[PDB]
């Protein structure tokens, strides 16, 4: 084994510093602690990268995710042992669900104290086993470079995800006394395989060229390659195929394009859902058929399954991970690998399509029939959440700046998804798989660090905001001019919505006492704005976006407004609840009675 | 009968409600979520117990711990799946380290969706395996009563600890269609009893033979209502000096002349010396962790010789056999509940007249190595230690029951050192895991447990930031907690270590703080601040007197080291002491190395 002596003499901590440089890391989010001190002393005043300090490790994790989402690079986290480590479990679980590249370094007690119920000791490798693509505890400093390189490679390959490297204090404080393999200190296809993939591509092209009512079901995977959107559009334009995206796919397709069906799924656009239930061929690109998208699985894509049975269609799946191939529904053709790459190889085999009048006409009728309708403002009423999104979307867009939107979890999140006009990739950063409330703020901060020149807006919910509102000061300390928008309905919207629907309006502990958000913002060091009256919304939104420096804008919005359309329970994607002003008014009455006038 | 049907017809959620009643649960801390909704609908407006809502599940967990610590009852947590569950990992790990009784119920996706990478699904049982005494996923509603009972029993027996019960939505929503064994619904040795007796005997002999005996007491003594009482008895009967661990504070009255105070890396010098010179160490409810033993090979040197010459050594009253002879080899091991065995051993103890020789040496140390520090000079900043002493008196002079919670760091050590501990179950601090942010949420839980008590949270600025959002929860729950922030605008304990071991190189140990007073006001509490020495007394009195929750920020002197200190490979007797000169020279050294920034 060829040896390297360049790290000989350095401490684990110093080697760590050098590896961050070699891994092209320009930002690290962390919080110091005793066990990890050897590494902190090493990166003290280091100019190899910028360090962002949160008030809580969970903040660090979510900042790393936001950063990764906006930059495309893996988010690096550096925390101490014990509580410092357990505090980043949620962010890891979150990054694991949404496939976000993240390398988490957790300090650990000295190897000689491990297993002795030592001070601030935790079985981090054990705890994080199920919420990381891979993890490891570095046994010796000689092993450090290697592990760091494996971590970054695993985190950024296949389906991106989080990895954890446990760093024992004695290992990071130790000095390298031995030369180590040159390989282990440097970063980073079968002919029959590529032969097999080309075969898959040909079969997929054959099916596409045969389809009469095709639909592109696009997900996050298309955004893991710079040319993803470009090729997706080319395919769409070439074969005249309408496109629908998941929550994590928004931004990949231009919603201004006539062929846009918008988001599909539980709270998706009726047109998109209808298109999916009636299509003879579903081309899934970088999407995992999760349960918030498929509706009742036995009712999913009936027309596509029928087409399959008749051998004239079905489902094509461009998936990068074998774990998600044929996991939820049986597919006819599975094109393994990087979606974008395979779309590029397949293009030339796709026959150019002149038009699909029938199909598009049907889709257009649904578009006229099922828009994202809702109860708009009326004289004297409170501001409507949906209206805020629509307006902010325009104001933000009219600035001509690059816009990135992050959100919390709940109704506001769904309305942001539905009513915002998505056009640019890597501009919507939201927690979908795990759905972590409190993701909004810290994610926005990370995103702003990744894209300093972008207008980063966090469309949050009051309950979600409370979870991590302490990072508000971090935004100030980090110099991230994030714009925090709070759609305040003084309730846990998404939950109350379910309680309204399935629990006869019995709201069990789903209404919390909020602090004065404006005074809070002021106390934290930001500008604070509030809006109650419809008349002032436009002015405030403009001041909000225009303000230089971090700013928080609270918008008092109407309460108990349900998010629609809605497919839940055993309903098929085409069996959605539609908005009805008459029914809303009826439900309202029924609510006041059932809650004894409480809500 | 053998079979019980008092549940047939009920939903898992309703059964859960009934079980909380049967388990004598009067408080539940939680946060709703989709997966756990069936249980929330069931406990809706339930009058079987009070529900406390935090802003974050971590808050719920720490509130449960504080509640458990102050009440003696297990803390019950109810959260949803996915993020709701992962958010209580830290509190569980914490409760696991300090042996706190806690039953955590986490909602889970329907059994039919488990393993499909379902919405808000997490392998909770897997994640929490290493930080819970036991955990389980309820497979069916028939199994619900059983699991709930096993959980509470395991959480409250042996060495208390946290347990987690995973509740699948389809299980809690399901209706019980089958009658279940009456036994399973009701809230639930050997001949080793001779070995214990033999031990209790040999220990009593060894104690009656000791010349320089020391009582090294821990949290274990507080796990029994008669612990403190029986501890004093033994101490008085055999005239033995008593030193307690951080988690032991409050089990022994520090007013008694036989009190050595706290031992350990930041413990009283006298306490450490006594331990190092003792021929016999009686360990009661303590696990010899590294923050106490110092350099293990240099620990209890005289106790060793006494052990080698068969005239003493180490006696250990431990409930968990796993912790016996885990750190240091003991001579006698009395298994079981410390309090119980102390009662059984009492009579076999010869009533000592006096130990004037031992006490002479001990009182010699007390006069020489007290908790000294650089006191306030004119115009200088308020000293953290002073605030603690002053508050200790003010709080005490109110005649109310006082409970103190803290964050993690220097302020925590100063609270331990300079407060005069006398009542059991009055100091609630995170020691094993040492979780910053524990202070506030713990105080809230403690206040819920003891409504009439004056609950004070002695926090640090950095620690406070971690969970400062629960400030509004305090208001919503109606818990008039008193939040004290010793603001040194730094991560004190870490800067102290950076000053000591890393040549005054403060790497990311200075966070930007918000306006604590405006923060408090925004959260709905009264906010007070103190900068001048002259106003400290007035503010402390107003602080304690204020009705309702209140926060007081006291600007204190920065870069103040917690002493004495036993770090690295130092034995408990090789501690660093306070020196006025040494400190002035250290300040100048810090100024030179930092250009003048610190
Ligand atoms: C309250 C709430 C409501 C929600 N409502 C909806 C809704 O109505 N509709 C909806 O769609 N979502 C909704 N979501 C989000 C949902 O839970 C899922 O997180 C999301 O739909 C998953 O989208 P995705 O499959 O595109 O992305 P991912 O879950 O990230 O999956 C991407 C898939 O693409 C693969 N992949 C990754 N990279 C590549 C590559 N380079 N080449 C090829 N394949 C690749 C991955 O292996 C994976 O299988 C909601 C979330 C919450 C919290
Ligand atoms: C910054 C910081 C500084 C610290 N500094 C110090 C210091 O200077 N000195 C110090 O002492 N601590 C210090 N600590 C706390 C320390 O880390 C340990 O948490 C603490 O000393 C453990 O005390 P304990 O053994 O009494 O309690 P535990 O750790 O709770 O252990 C109790 C033991 O008693 C047993 N037990 C429980 N119930 C019973 C029963 N009913 N009958 C019999 N046995 C029972 C248990 O099995 C266990 O072995 C510090 C913590 C932090 C965060
Ligand atoms: C929290 C760090 O814990 C260590 O990793 C650790 C654990 C068990 C035994 C010895 C050490 S050690 O003696 O290698 N290191 C420390 O004890 N460090 C340490 N750092 C800080 Cl900032 C505070 C502290 O103690 C109160 N202790
Ligand atoms: C978050 C709870 O998730 C469920 O446990 C879950 C998981 C996978 C598949 C079906 C369900 S389900 O159809 O039994 N329940 C729900 O889907 N519930 C649910 N509750 C809320 Cl408050 C919001 C929500 O969706 C946006 N969904
Ligand atoms: C959640 C968490 N993150 C990091 C640590 C590491 N840590 C232990 S003590 C300490 C010092 C800072 O506290 P502070 O509240 O400012 O009080 P001080 O020590 O200054 O009195 C730190 C950062 C921890 N214990 N818990
Ligand atoms: C409560 C909940 C979603 C949304 C609620 O409220 P919010 O005010 O933030 O937004 P709206 O829905 O009211 O807009 N689900 C459980 C949950 C608990 N805890 C965490 C960290 N994440 C979660 N998803
Ligand atoms: K849209
Ligand atoms: K004391
Ligand atoms: Mg809300
Ligand atoms: Mg501090």
Cβ-in-10-Å burial (0-12, 13-18, 19+) of B430 comes to buried
Please work out whether the CB of residue B119 comes within 6 Å of at least one atom of ligand 4: yes
Q: Which of B437, B469, B513 faces A469 most closely, judged by CB atoms?
A: B469
For residue A406, report the phi and psi dihedrals to the nearest 5 degrees.
-120, 160
DSSP string, B351-381: -----HHHHHHHHHHHHHS--------TTPP
Instruction: Cite the beta strand spans of B49-194 per DSSP E.
Output: 50-52, 75-79, 102-108, 134-137, 162-168, 180-181
Q: Could you tell me how far CA B54 lies from the centroid of its own chain?
A: 20
Report, in this order, helix, strand and coil percent for chain B, each rounded to 5. Answer: 45, 15, 40
Which of A346, A357, A363, A194 minimizes the C-alpha distance to A276? A363
For residue B371, report the phi and psi dihedrals to the nearest 5 degrees.
-80, 70
Is A591 marked as binding a ligand?
no
Domain A372-599, CATH number (from 3.10.270.10, 3.30.565.10, 3.65.10.10, 3.40.50.970): 3.40.50.970
Element counts in chain B: helices (H) and strands (E): 25, 20
For residue A235, report the phi and psi dihedrals to the nearest 5 degrees.
-60, -50
Strand partners, B135: B164
Residue of B nearest to A89 (CA): B86
Rounded to the nearest 10 degrees, how much is the dihedral formed by the CA atoms of A557, A561, A567, A568? 110
- What lies within 8 Å, CB to CB, of A363 at 6+ separation is A242, A261, A271, A275
- The residues after which chain A has a C–N gap greater than 2.5 Å are 188
Name every protein residue with a CB atom under 6 angstroms from any ligand 1 atom: A 98-99, 159, 219-221, 224-225, 246-249, 263, 265-268, 286-288, 290, 292-293, 318-321, 324, 338-339, 409, 414, 432-433, 435, 494; B 119
Residue B86 contacts A where some CB pair is shorter than 8 Å = yes
Chain A residue numbers touching B318 (CB-CB < 8 A): none
Q: Under an 8 A CB cutoff, do B44 and A97 touch?
A: no
Return the structure tokens found at A434: 């795990």
Q: Under an 8 A CB cutoff, do A118 and B498 touch?
A: no
Strand, coil or helix: B457:
strand
DSSP string, B72-93: SSPEEEEE-STHHHHTTHHHHH
Please work out whether the CB of residue A325 comes within 6 Å of at least one atom of ligand 3: no
d(CA B77, CA B63): 9
For residue A588, the number of C-alpha atoms closer than 13 Å in the C-beta half-sphere is 12
B371-598: CATH number: 3.40.50.970
Please work out whether the CB of residue B432 comes within 6 Å of at least one atom of ligand 5: no
Q: Under an 8 A CB cutoff, do A83 and B97 touch?
A: no
d(CA B441, CA B444): 5
Pairing mode of beta strands A214-218, A281-285: parallel
Strand partners, B3: B181
Instruction: Cite the beta strand spans of A206-299 per DSSP E.
Output: 214-218, 243-245, 260-263, 281-285
Residue of A nearest to B113 (CA): A291
Pairing mode of beta strands B242-244, A27-31: unpaired
Return the structure tokens found at A410: 């709940």
Q: Which of A122, A470, A498 faces B468 most closely, judged by CB atoms?
A: A470
d(CA B570, CA B573): 8
Cβ-in-10-Å burial (0-12, 13-18, 19+) of A555 comes to buried
Return the structure tokens found at A37: 């001190």
d(CA A219, CA A231): 14
Ligand 1 center–CA A283 separation, angstroms: 15
Ligand 3 center–CA B497 separation, angstroms: 9
Q: Under an 8 A CB cutoff, do B126 and A123 touch?
A: no
Is B334 marked as binding a ligand?
yes
CB atoms within 10 A of CB A585: 11
d(CA A400, CA A420): 15
Q: Could you tell me how far CA B393 lies from the centroid of its own chain?
A: 23
Please work out whether the CB of residue B319 comes within 6 Å of at least one atom of ligand 2: yes
List b or e across A60-76, with b for residues whose CB sees 16 or more CB atoms inside 10 angstroms. Answer: bbbbbbbbbbbbbbbbb
Is A329 marked as binding a ligand?
yes
CB atoms within 10 A of CB B450: 18
Chain B residue numbers touching A56 (CB-CB < 8 A): 437, 465-467
CA end-to-end span of chain B, whole Å? 74
Which of A123, A96, A98 minimizes the C-alpha distance to A109? A123
- The residues after which chain B has a C–N gap greater than 2.5 Å are 188
Task: Note if A119 is an active site residue.
Answer: yes
Cβ-in-10-Å burial (0-12, 13-18, 19+) of A182 comes to middle
Instruction: Specify whether the CB–CB gap between A551 and A544 falls below 8 A.
Output: yes
Q: Under an 8 A CB cutoff, do A499 and B41 touch?
A: yes
**Ligand 6 atom 19: the closest Cα is on which residue?**
B84
Which of B464, B403, B475, B469 minimizes the C-alpha distance to B439? B464
Residue A47 contacts B where some CB pair is shorter than 8 Å = no
d(CA B52, CA B478): 10
Instruction: Specify whether the CB–CB gap between A148 and A19 falls below 8 A.
Output: yes
Three-point CA angle A581, A585, A591, nearest 5°: 140
Cβ-in-10-Å burial (0-12, 13-18, 19+) of B500 comes to middle
Rounded to the nearest 10 degrees, how much is the dihedral formed by the CA atoms of B284, B286, B290, B293? -10
CATH topology of domain A189-371: Rossmann fold (3.40.50)
Residue B41 contacts A where some CB pair is shorter than 8 Å = yes
Strand partners, A78: A30, A105
Alpha helices in B369-449 (DSSP H): 384-396, 410-418, 439-449
For residue A488, report the phi and psi dihedrals to the nearest 5 degrees.
-85, 110
**Ligand 3 atom 6: the closest Cα is on which residue?**
A109
Which of B278, B358, B296, B287 minimizes the C-alpha distance to B319? B287
The ranges assigned to domains in chain B are 1-188, 189-370, 371-598
The technique by which this structure was obtained is X-ray
d(CA A376, CA A386): 8
d(CA B372, CA B517): 31
Residue of A nearest to B517 (CA): A523
d(CA B519, CA B160): 37
d(CA A51, CA A105): 14
- What lies within 8 Å, CB to CB, of B268 at 6+ separation is B243, B260, B261, B262, B369, B370, B371, B417, B564
Residue with tokens 């972008």: A454
Chain A stretch 294-333, residues whose beta carbon is closer than 8 A to a beta carbon of chain B: 327-328
Cα separation values, A361 from A238, A240, A357, A365, Å: 18, 13, 6, 6
Return the structure tokens found at B339: 């309090």
Which of A329, A335, A333 minimizes the C-alpha distance to A300? A329
Ligand 10 center–CA B530 separation, angstroms: 16
CATH fold match for the domains B1-188 and B189-370: yes
Walk across the sheet containing A50-52 and list its strands.
A50-52, A27-31, A75-79, A102-108, A162-168, A134-137
SS (H, E, C) A406-468: EECCCHHHHHHHHHCCCCCCCCEECCCCCCCCCCHHHHHHHHHHHCCCCEEEEEEEHHHHHHH
CATH architecture of A1-188: 3-Layer(aba) Sandwich (3.40)
Strand, coil or helix: B292:
helix
CATH topology of domain B189-370: Rossmann fold (3.40.50)
Three-point CA angle B98, B101, B106, nearest 5°: 110
Resolution of the coordinates, Å: 2.8
Task: Note if B354 is an active site residue.
Answer: no
H/E stretch holding A68: helix A57-71
Instruction: Specify whether the CB–CB gap between A296 and A263 falls below 8 A.
Output: no
DSSP letter (8 states) at residue A120: T
Please work out whether the CB of residue A487 comes within 6 Å of at least one atom of ligand 6: yes
For residue A218, the number of C-alpha atoms closer than 13 Å in the C-beta half-sphere is 31
d(CA A280, CA A267): 23
Please work out whether the CB of residue B159 comes within 6 Å of at least one atom of ligand 2: yes
Which of A203, A292, A219, A278 minimizes the C-alpha distance to A253? A219
């Amino acid at each position: 084994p060829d040896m390297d002596t360049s790290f000989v003499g350095l401490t684990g901590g110093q080697i760590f510093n050098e590896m961050m440089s070699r891994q092209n890391v320009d930002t690290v989010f962390g919080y110091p602690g005793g066990a990890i001190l050897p590494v902190y002393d090493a990166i003290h005043n280091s100019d190899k990268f910028n360090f962002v300090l949160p008030k809580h490790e969970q903040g660090a994790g979510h900042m790393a995710e936001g950063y990764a989402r906006a930059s495309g690079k893996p988010g690096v986290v550096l925390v101490t042992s014990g509580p410092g480590a357990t505090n980043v479990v949620t962010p890891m679980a979150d990054a694991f669900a949404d496939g976000i590249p993240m390398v988490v370094f957790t300090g650990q007690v000295p190897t000689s104290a491990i297993g002795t119920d030592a001070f601030q000791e935790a079985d981090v490798v054990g705890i994080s086993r199920s919420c990381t693509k891979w993890n490891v505890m570095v046994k010796s400093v000689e092993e450090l470079p290697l592990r760091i390189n494996e971590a970054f490679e695993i985190a950024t390959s296949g389906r991106p995800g989080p990895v954890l490297v446990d760093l024992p204090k004695d290992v990071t404080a130790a000095i390298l006394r031995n030369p180590i393999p040159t390989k282990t200190t440097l970063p980073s296809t079968s002919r029959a395989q590529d032969e097999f993939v080309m075969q898959s591509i040909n079969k997929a092209a054959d099916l596409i060229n045969l389809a009469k009512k095709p639909v592109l079901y696009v997900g996050a995977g298309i955004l893991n390659h710079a040319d993803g959107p470009r090729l997706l559009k080319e395919l769409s334009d070439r074969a005249q195929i309408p496109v629908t995206t998941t929550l994590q796919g928004l931004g990949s397709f231009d919603q201004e394009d006539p062929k846009s069906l918008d988001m599909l799924g539980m709270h998706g656009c009726a047109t998109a859902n209808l298109a999916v239930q009636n299509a003879d061929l579903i081309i899934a690109v970088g999407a995992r058929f999760d349960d918030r998208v498929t509706g009742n699985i036995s009712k999913f894509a009936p027309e596509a399954r029928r087409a399959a049975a008749e051998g004239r269609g079905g489902i094509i799946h461009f998936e990068v991970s074998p774990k998600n191939i044929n996991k939820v529904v049986q597919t006819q053709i599975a094109v393994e690998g990087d979606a974008t790459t395979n779309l590029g190889k397949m293009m030339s085999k796709i026959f150019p399509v002149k038009e699909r009048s029938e199909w598009f006409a049907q889709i257009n009728k649904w578009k006229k029939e099922y828009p994202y309708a809702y109860m708009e403002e009326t004289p004297g009423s409170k501001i409507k959440p949906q209206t805020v999104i629509k307006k902010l979307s325009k104001v933000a867009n009219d600035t001509g700046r690059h816009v990135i939107v992050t959100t919390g979890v709940g109704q506001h999140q769904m309305w942001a998804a539905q009513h915002w006009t998505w056009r640019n990739p890597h501009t919507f950063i939201t927690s979908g798989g795990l759905g972590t409330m409190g993701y909004g703020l810290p994610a926005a901060i990370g995103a702003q660090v990744a894209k300093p020149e972008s207008l980063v807006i966090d469309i949050d919910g009051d309950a979600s905001f409370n979870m991590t509102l302490t990072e508000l000061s971090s935004a100030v300390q980090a110099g991230t001019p994030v714009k925090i928008l709070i759609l305040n309905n003084e309730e846990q919207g998404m939950v109350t919505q379910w309680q309204s629907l399935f629990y006869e309006h019995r709201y069990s502990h789903t209404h919390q006492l909020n602090p004065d958000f404006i005074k809070l913002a002021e106390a934290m060091g930001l500008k604070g704005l509030r809006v109650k009256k419809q008349e002032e919304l436009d002015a405030k939104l403009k001041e909000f976006v225009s303000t230089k420096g971090p700013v928080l804008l609270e918008v008092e919005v109407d309460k108990k407004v349900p998010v629609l359309p809605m497919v839940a329970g055993g309903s098929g994607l085409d069996e959605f609840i539609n908005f009805d002003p008459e029914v809303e008014r009826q439900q309202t009455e029924l609510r006041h009675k059932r809650t004894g006038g409480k809500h």
